[PDB]
Enzyme design. Structure first.
Site, short mmCIF file in Angstrom:
data_model
loop_
_atom_site.label_atom_id
_atom_site.label_comp_id
_atom_site.label_asym_id
_atom_site.label_seq_id
_atom_site.Cartn_x
_atom_site.Cartn_y
_atom_site.Cartn_z
N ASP A 1 10.30 -3.34 0.36
CA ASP A 1 9.65 -4.33 0.48
C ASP A 1 10.29 -5.39 0.88
O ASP A 1 9.85 -6.70 1.09
CB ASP A 1 8.34 -4.56 -0.15
CG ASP A 1 8.91 -4.67 -1.82
OD1 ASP A 1 9.65 -5.38 -1.96
OD2 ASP A 1 8.36 -3.96 -2.52
N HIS B 1 17.23 2.24 -1.17
CA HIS B 1 16.51 2.85 -0.07
C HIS B 1 16.56 2.14 1.13
O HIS B 1 15.39 2.53 2.19
CB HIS B 1 15.13 2.97 -0.41
CG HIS B 1 15.11 4.31 -1.31
ND1 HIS B 1 15.97 4.43 -2.64
CD2 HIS B 1 14.32 5.31 -1.14
CE1 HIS B 1 15.52 5.52 -3.18
NE2 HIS B 1 14.48 6.28 -2.41
N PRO C 1 0.89 -1.34 -0.04
CA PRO C 1 -0.07 0.15 -0.05
C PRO C 1 0.86 1.26 -0.10
O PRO C 1 1.77 1.47 0.97
CB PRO C 1 -0.75 -0.21 1.31
CG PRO C 1 0.26 -0.96 2.12
CD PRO C 1 0.98 -1.68 1.45
N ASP C 2 0.49 2.27 -0.72
CA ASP C 2 0.95 3.28 -0.89
C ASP C 2 0.82 4.11 0.42
O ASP C 2 -0.46 4.55 0.57
CB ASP C 2 0.83 4.18 -2.10
CG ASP C 2 1.64 5.42 -2.05
OD1 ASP C 2 2.75 5.57 -1.67
OD2 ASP C 2 1.13 6.63 -2.69
N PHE C 3 1.64 4.22 1.41
CA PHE C 3 1.36 5.05 2.79
C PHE C 3 1.17 6.64 2.23
O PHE C 3 0.59 7.32 3.04
CB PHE C 3 2.60 5.00 3.67
CG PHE C 3 3.65 6.03 3.28
CD1 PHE C 3 4.44 5.50 2.21
CD2 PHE C 3 3.89 7.08 4.09
CE1 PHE C 3 5.52 6.28 1.81
CE2 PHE C 3 5.06 7.65 3.83
CZ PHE C 3 5.84 7.63 2.73
N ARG C 4 1.60 7.09 1.19
CA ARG C 4 1.25 8.57 0.73
C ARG C 4 -0.28 8.67 0.52
O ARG C 4 -0.62 9.79 0.64
CB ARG C 4 2.22 8.72 -0.32
CG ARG C 4 3.44 9.15 -0.03
CD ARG C 4 4.22 9.61 -1.36
NE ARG C 4 5.72 9.14 -1.42
CZ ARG C 4 6.30 8.19 -1.68
NH1 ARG C 4 5.32 7.21 -2.23
NH2 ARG C 4 7.50 7.88 -1.63
N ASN D 1 12.56 -0.13 -3.71
CA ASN D 1 11.54 -0.72 -2.72
C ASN D 1 12.46 -0.98 -1.60
O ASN D 1 13.44 -1.49 -1.57
CB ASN D 1 10.82 -1.68 -3.39
CG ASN D 1 10.01 -1.09 -4.73
OD1 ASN D 1 9.77 0.21 -4.60
ND2 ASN D 1 9.67 -1.88 -5.83
#
Ligand SMILES: [Zn+2]
Length: 274
Positions: A111, A128, A35-38, A109
């Site tokens: 994940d 990242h 899920p895009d937390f943004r 990513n």
């Protein structure tokens, strides 16, 4: 004389490209439901407003972590390995490795799904960061991700066994420098004979420049909804676009390689082990 997706597919079968460098972004994972937390609406986004952050990106700020770690760790719980599983895109790259073709996979990513699909560490550049490991904020000891898995899943903030400091997963926060392995790009891109860009715009630097870092004679296959970035602005003769859904474009090239069965086969074994 342009190239087509089959063109490239055949350069891999003939193995005229056997040192492939792949660059992946958020797009290869949203198929697996990351899920895009943004973006509002997602479950994770909901839980994050609960706190006093001025904006969603401040979880990745050191100040608005040492002020309150709990927002970050709310993301940490959601993404922590196992909760989600890789999709066909990761597995094509798994396969690409097993077939001996994968020079390096550079991911934006966190994940860690590249890990789970079975690509060895030596092949990955998690630019990242990763929840795979952690480090004491105070005493700097590292920790395998399992140790903080206990406290993380139970909404406790993991303190260090030696000194009781916060044990922050090894996620790159805004302002901290990119991981050391990012500096493999000096050798990888000159040796790359095929560049493979999946599911990201390559708009944020320093990844944007890396696209122009293969030799001119090297083809750059892009697979993404749109056509933007240094591939849009400064294209090369050897470039190939595959616009639209990433999952689909991945399957079309697995087909044209003739691997479509060997792929279903890998997807079989690895779904059981999870
Ligand atoms: Zn410590």
């Amino acid at each position: 004389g342009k190239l087509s997706l089959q063109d490239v597919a055949e350069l891999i079968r003939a193995r005229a490209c056997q040192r492939v460098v792949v660059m992946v972004g958020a797009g290869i994972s949203t198929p697996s439901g990351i899920p895009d937390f943004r973006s509002p609406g997602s479950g994770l986004y909901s839980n994050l407003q609960q706190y006093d952050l001025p904006y969603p990106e401040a979880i990745f700020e050191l100040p608005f972590f040492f002020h309150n770690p709990k927002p970050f760790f709310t993301l940490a719980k959601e993404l922590y390995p196992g909760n989600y599983k890789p999709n066909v895109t990761h597995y094509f790259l798994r396969l690409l490795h097993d077939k001996g073709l994968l020079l390096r996979l550079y991911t934006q990513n966190i994940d860690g799904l590249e890990r789970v699909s079975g690509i060895p560490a030596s092949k990955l550049v998690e630019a990242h960061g990763t929840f795979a490991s952690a480090t004491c904020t105070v005493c700097q000891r590292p920790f395998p991700g399992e140790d903080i898995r206990a406290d993380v899943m139970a909404d406790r903030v993991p303190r260090c066994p030696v000194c009781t400091g916060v044990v922050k997963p090894d996620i790159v926060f805004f302002g901290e420098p990119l991981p050391q392995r990012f500096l493999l790009h000096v050798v990888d891109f000159p040796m790359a004979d095929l560049l493979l860009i999946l599911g990201t715009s390559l708009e944020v630097e320093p990844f944007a420049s890396l696209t122009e870092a293969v030799r001119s004679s090297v083809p750059r296959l892009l697979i993404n909804r749109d056509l933007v970035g240094p591939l849009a602005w400064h294209p090369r003769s050897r470039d190939v676009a595959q616009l639209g859904d990433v999952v689909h474009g991945v399957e079309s090239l697995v087909e044209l390689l003739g691997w479509t069965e060997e792929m279903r086969d890998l997807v079989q074994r690895e779904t059981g082990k999870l």
